[PDB]
Design a binder for this molecule. Structure first.
Ligand SMILES: OC[C@H]1O[C@@H](O[C@@H]2[C@@H](O)[C@H](O[C@@H]3[C@@H](O)[C@H](O)O[C@H](CO)[C@H]3O)O[C@H](CO)[C@H]2O)[C@H](O)[C@@H](O)[C@@H]1O
Ligand SMILES: OC[C@H]1O[C@@H](O[C@@H]2[C@@H](O)[C@H](O)O[C@H](CO)[C@H]2O)[C@H](O)[C@@H](O)[C@@H]1O
Length: 247
């Protein structure tokens, strides 16, 4: 049976500039859901996959941003994106969770993803502290990011975080190879897709790079899932079409 755990990360620049690109997505392959780092829904999706709204940061707790979260028909909602790098302490995020976000479960019966921190000591320590602070009202999923060049190290990290936090499944809300060598990008992507596909405690995983411009200097141009014209790279085709993935 077709294993369907792959998330379509749909950056708002796609919605802003190249809506039409969504209609070129393959929906008959292992794509299973969609997120866009925002509270609001990408209309061009036309409900062809479940959407996970995100409470990205403190700017998304009030006004029309919070109204989008309160009114959504979608089942799963992400909390803060890399809060350890936006000056949000574990204690401050635990308070906002109890006072405001938890109601989305107790009252609106949504499932909640923990904040997704970076795979560095600062991030590992942040999520360790926050999960302890809200242990009496834990999240439904543990949200993880991972960027690097060695697939064996991402596997060891997921296995490591699953042992440290064994009470819920893991969502990899962002991951990618940062290698500038395309064979090493393709090799890691294929390895981790197939490994996570056959690992029950990984609910879903979200490959980064489906946008026209480079996000920053950190991510690899060889790992891009969209060309500058808005067409899809061969890596994107394989991601959304092939199960198992192959090089
Ligand atoms: O700051 C730029 C960029 O950083 C991203 O986080 C990275 C981590 O992905 C990276 O992870 C390392 C792995 O690549 C490596 O294989 O293993 C080590 C541990 O042995 C990991 O730490 O670590 C660096 C810190 O040196 C982080 O910068 C963020 O997710 C991203 O948002 C940001 O753009
Ligand atoms: O096989 C998993 C690992 O793949 C590595 O890339 C390989 C390259 O080093 C080599 O040159 O080519 C093969 C395919 O011909 C690649 O698979 C990645 O660099 C690793 O991160 C990954 O774990």
């Amino acid at each position: 049976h077709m294993v369907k755990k792959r998330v379509l990360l749909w950056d708002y620049t796609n919605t802003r500039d190249v809506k039409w690109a969504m209609d070129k997505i393959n929906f008959k392959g292992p794509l299973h859901s969609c997120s866009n780092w925002n509270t609001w829904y990408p209309d061009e999706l036309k409900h062809r996959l479940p959407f996970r709204p995100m409470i990205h940061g403190k700017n998304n707790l009030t006004g029309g941003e919070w109204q989008n979260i309160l009114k959504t028909n979608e089942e799963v909602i992400h909390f803060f994106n890399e809060p350890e790098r936006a000056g949000i302490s574990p204690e401050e995020a635990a308070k906002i969770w109890n006072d405001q976000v938890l109601a989305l479960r107790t009252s609106h019966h949504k499932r909640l993803v923990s904040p997704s921190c970076a795979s560095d000591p600062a991030g590992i320590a942040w999520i360790k502290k926050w999960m302890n602070l809200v242990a009496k009202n834990p999240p439904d999923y543990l949200g993880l990011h991972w960027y690097g060049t060695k697939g064996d190290e991402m596997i060891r990290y997921l296995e490591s975080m699953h042992k440290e936090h064994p009470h819920q499944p893991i969502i990899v809300s962002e991951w990618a190879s940062t290698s500038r060598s395309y064979p090493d990008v393709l090799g890691l992507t294929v390895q981790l897709a197939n490994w996570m596909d056959s690992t029950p405690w990984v609910a879903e995983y979200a490959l980064f790079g489906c946008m026209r411009q480079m996000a920053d200097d950190f991510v690899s141009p060889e790992a891009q899932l969209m060309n500058k014209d808005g067409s899809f790279t061969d890596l994107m085709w394989k991601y959304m079409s092939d199960q198992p993935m192959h090089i």
